[PDB]
Design a protein around this motif. Structure first.
Motif, PDB file in Angstrom:
ATOM      1  N   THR A 135      -4.923  12.031   2.643  1.00  0.00           N
ATOM      2  CA  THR A 135      -6.357  11.910   2.902  1.00  0.00           C
ATOM      3  C   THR A 135      -7.093  12.506   1.707  1.00  0.00           C
ATOM      4  N   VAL A 136      -7.847  11.660   1.008  1.00  0.00           N
ATOM      5  CA  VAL A 136      -8.580  12.046  -0.196  1.00  0.00           C
ATOM      6  C   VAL A 136     -10.058  12.212   0.127  1.00  0.00           C
ATOM      7  N   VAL A 232      -6.607   2.759   4.431  1.00  0.00           N
ATOM      8  CA  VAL A 232      -5.789   1.817   3.668  1.00  0.00           C
ATOM      9  C   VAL A 232      -4.563   1.485   4.516  1.00  0.00           C
ATOM     10  N   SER A 233      -4.559   0.299   5.116  1.00  0.00           N
ATOM     11  CA  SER A 233      -3.437  -0.156   5.947  1.00  0.00           C
ATOM     12  C   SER A 233      -2.184  -0.472   5.123  1.00  0.00           C
ATOM     13  N   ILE A 259     -10.768   8.686   2.243  1.00  0.00           N
ATOM     14  CA  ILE A 259      -9.882   7.526   2.137  1.00  0.00           C
ATOM     15  C   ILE A 259      -8.518   8.000   2.629  1.00  0.00           C
ATOM     16  N   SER A 260      -7.984   7.377   3.681  1.00  0.00           N
ATOM     17  CA  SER A 260      -6.651   7.739   4.188  1.00  0.00           C
ATOM     18  C   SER A 260      -5.635   6.613   3.984  1.00  0.00           C
ATOM     19  N   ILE A 261      -4.401   7.009   3.676  1.00  0.00           N
ATOM     20  CA  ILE A 261      -3.289   6.086   3.465  1.00  0.00           C
ATOM     21  C   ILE A 261      -1.989   6.730   3.942  1.00  0.00           C
ATOM     22  N   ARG A 277      -5.291  18.890  -5.394  1.00  0.00           N
ATOM     23  CA  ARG A 277      -5.482  19.338  -4.013  1.00  0.00           C
ATOM     24  C   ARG A 277      -6.364  18.416  -3.173  1.00  0.00           C
ATOM     25  N   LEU A 278      -7.227  17.637  -3.828  1.00  0.00           N
ATOM     26  CA  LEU A 278      -8.099  16.679  -3.138  1.00  0.00           C
ATOM     27  C   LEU A 278      -7.320  15.623  -2.345  1.00  0.00           C
ATOM     28  N   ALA A 279      -6.120  15.281  -2.816  1.00  0.00           N
ATOM     29  CA  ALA A 279      -5.183  14.437  -2.069  1.00  0.00           C
ATOM     30  C   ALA A 279      -4.377  15.280  -1.070  1.00  0.00           C
ATOM     31  N   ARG A 280      -4.996  15.570   0.072  1.00  0.00           N
ATOM     32  CA  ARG A 280      -4.387  16.403   1.123  1.00  0.00           C
ATOM     33  C   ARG A 280      -3.367  15.632   1.956  1.00  0.00           C
ATOM     34  N   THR A 281      -2.210  16.252   2.194  1.00  0.00           N
ATOM     35  CA  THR A 281      -1.187  15.712   3.093  1.00  0.00           C
ATOM     36  C   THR A 281      -1.511  16.124   4.533  1.00  0.00           C
ATOM     37  N   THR A 282      -2.031  15.173   5.305  1.00  0.00           N
ATOM     38  CA  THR A 282      -2.488  15.412   6.679  1.00  0.00           C
ATOM     39  C   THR A 282      -1.440  15.129   7.758  1.00  0.00           C
TER      40      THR A 282
END
Ligand SMILES: CC(C)(COP(=O)(O)OP(=O)(O)OC[C@H]1O[C@@H](n2cnc3c(N)ncnc32)[C@H](O)[C@@H]1OP(=O)(O)O)[C@@H](O)C(=O)NCCC(=O)NCCS
Ligand SMILES: Cn1c2ccc(F)cc2c2nnc(SCCN3CCCCC3)nc21
Ligand code: NA
Length: 396
Positions: A135-136, A232-233, A259-261, A277-282
């Motif tokens: 999740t960005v 993002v599917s 934006i989630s993928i 860090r902005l690209a968080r692993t949720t």
């Protein structure tokens, strides 16, 4: 309580069971399309005595493994037991029958996606790919000076409608799946389903849009409830330029906050940005599960790392034979032996190692594979590692 292959009259009963068992079940039309991927004698049902109280099947799939090798794969799916017939041995009966059929048919591997994580280990399946939700927060997102396609002039990515560029998506995906471990051939009927899901649903999901590059695509929609989240599917990129270019466009969704993928652990996206860090692993979960049906066929078909030098060992699978395993020049030779075992593991552990998603040392640290030789562990780690990262193609 008998077990047999379903006739045409059983299928309405199976769809009833499916609709009650799976919350993602759409209907008979969708189900009939998926059913084209099931071979003759690929399905089993349990009737009471009459109605269907259990079902299981496999589909004919093509799985890419390390070394760009494509294996025929039995994709288990549509597994269900009636809530009225639980704890009665129906699953163990159905899975045993399907595995007998899968083995006799000549599939070296079988595969599935698990509804729960504690069920399929005892049937020889081990988790072989890892899913990773990123999740960005795109408001702070700025690309690194080194990131590709960050110069002046016209962009390479186009905003398009999914339905109008089907052919280009198929071609890109086909290239992708062939060169990546975990890649699956997607038949026409699943492309039909995918594109059907892209349209806006009345009181359901919003309209999907596509970002198209010559060597990559991304499919996305705004979330139903959260109007500042874009999901993002699917994102498929053949080159690094395409991957970076698509993410420049996705971070260009200035309407959105996030934006989630769902991707894989080695996704290079965090390193594309100035702030990793902005690209968080949720979210984090097992993807594809693997059961090795034939040990020597599976091990000899796969490609191995050229870096490790030639070595030899004796592997025992608990109830799957003992083998002299010689690996060298990126290949393996796997022959029967009664010599003393140097490595021991259950069948499912071998599945978890097979695509290179889990290290042998990690499983050894949990005592899931026994060996008194730590040098042998290092060699296995390196040999079974994959140079192209392991990915998950699509759920089934
Ligand atoms: C079958 C189901 C939902 C649970 O029903 P169930 O009544 O526990 O199944 P059974 O009792 O016939 O299974 C027998 C054995 O499996 C275990 N489960 C039981 O513990 C039992 O073993 P034990 O007798 O040694 O304890 C479940 O096992 C299952 O996971 N099905 C998944 C469906 C699915 O994911 N479908 C999509 C494709 S993966
Ligand atoms: C996977 N499979 C099937 C396999 C064999 C079959 F004879 C029917 C079916 C079938 N019908 N409806 C559906 S609807 C759920 C689709 N979902 C696939 C997994 C990920 C999310 C979407 N899925 C089916
Ligand atoms: Na059961």
């Amino acid at each position: 309580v008998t077990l047999c292959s379903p006739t045409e009259d059983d299928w309405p009963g199976m769809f009833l069971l499916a609709a009650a068992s799976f919350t993602d079940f759409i209907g008979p039309e969708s189900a009939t399309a998926w059913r084209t991927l099931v071979p003759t004698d690929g399905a089993v049902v349990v009737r009471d005595g009459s109605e269907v109280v259990g079902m299981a099947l496999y589909m004919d799939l093509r799985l890419t493994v390390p070394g760009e090798v494509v294996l025929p794969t039995a994709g288990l799916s549509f597994v269900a037991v009636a809530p009225t017939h639980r704890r009665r041995g129906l699953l163990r009966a159905m899975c045993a029958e399907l595995h007998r059929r899968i083995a006799d048919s000549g599939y070296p591997v079988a595969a599935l996606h698990a509804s729960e994580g504690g069920i399929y280990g005892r049937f020889g399946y081990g988790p072989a790919t890892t899913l990773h939700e990123l999740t960005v927060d795109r408001r702070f997102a700025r690309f690194h000076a080194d990131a590709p396609g960050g110069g002046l002039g016209g962009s390479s990515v186009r905003l398009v409608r999914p339905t109008e560029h089907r052919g280009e998506f198929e071609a890109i995906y086909e290239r992708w799946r062939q060169q990546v471990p975990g890649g699956l051939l997607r038949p026409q009927v699943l492309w039909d389903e995918l594109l059907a899901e892209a349209k806006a649903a009345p009181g359901g999901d919003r309209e999907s849009f596509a970002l198209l590059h010559p060597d990559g695509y991304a499919l996305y929609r705004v979330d139903r409830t959260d109007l500042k989240l874009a999901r993002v599917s699917e994102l498929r990129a053949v080159t690094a330029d395409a991957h970076c270019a698509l993410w420049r466009a996705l971070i260009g969704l200035d309407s959105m906050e996030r934006i989630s993928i769902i991707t894989h652990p080695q996704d290079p996206l965090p390193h594309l940005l100035t702030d990793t860090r902005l690209a968080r692993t949720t979210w984090r979960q097992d993807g594809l599960w693997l059961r090795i049906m034939n040990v020597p066929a599976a091990l000899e078909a796969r490609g191995y790392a050229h870096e490790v030098g030639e070595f030899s060992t004796v592997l025992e699978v608990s109830d799957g034979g003992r083998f002299a395993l010689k690996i060298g020049d990126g290949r393996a030779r796997c022959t029967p032996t009664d010599a003393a075992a140097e490595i021991e593991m259950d069948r499912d552990v071998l599945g978890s190692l097979y695509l290179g998603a889990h290290r042998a040392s990690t499983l050894a640290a949990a005592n899931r594979l026994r060996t008194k030789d730590s040098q042998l562990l290092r060699r296995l780690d390196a040999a079974f590692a994959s140079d192209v990262p392991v990915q998950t193609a699509f759920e089934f």
